């Protein structure tokens, strides 16, 4: 919203979208970091020295 | 001949008018959108 009127009115609309956005960016790394716990898991005694 | 004046004897057709609601209506849907999902895509309208 207000897509420019002031330079501070313009920074509240894309702060308020980046920090919806992180909820999502956050759920998806915490799937990845399980994928690499699991990952570290098998290289531990599948792999030599 | 006289009696017909060509600015009513001739027309020429065009295209018609579209009412000032259209335009509203969508700007409505696609605000309504972009609320709703949280991205504004920079788009309806230029992408700059």
């Given at each position: 919203a207000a897509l420019g009127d002031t330079a501070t009115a313009v920074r509240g609309a894309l702060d308020a979208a980046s920090k919806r956005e992180l909820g999502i960016l956050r759920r998806l790394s915490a799937g990845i970091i399980e994928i690499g716990r699991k990952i570290i898991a098998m290289n531990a005694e599948f792999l030599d020295d | 001949n006289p009696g017909a004046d060509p600015?009513?004897?001739?027309?020429?057709h065009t295209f018609p008018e579209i009412p000032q609601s259209a335009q509203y209506m969508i700007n409505l849907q696609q605000a309504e959108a972009e609320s709703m999902t949280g991205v504004k895509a920079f788009n309806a309208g230029i992408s700059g």
């Open positions: - | 600015r009513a004897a001739v027309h020429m």
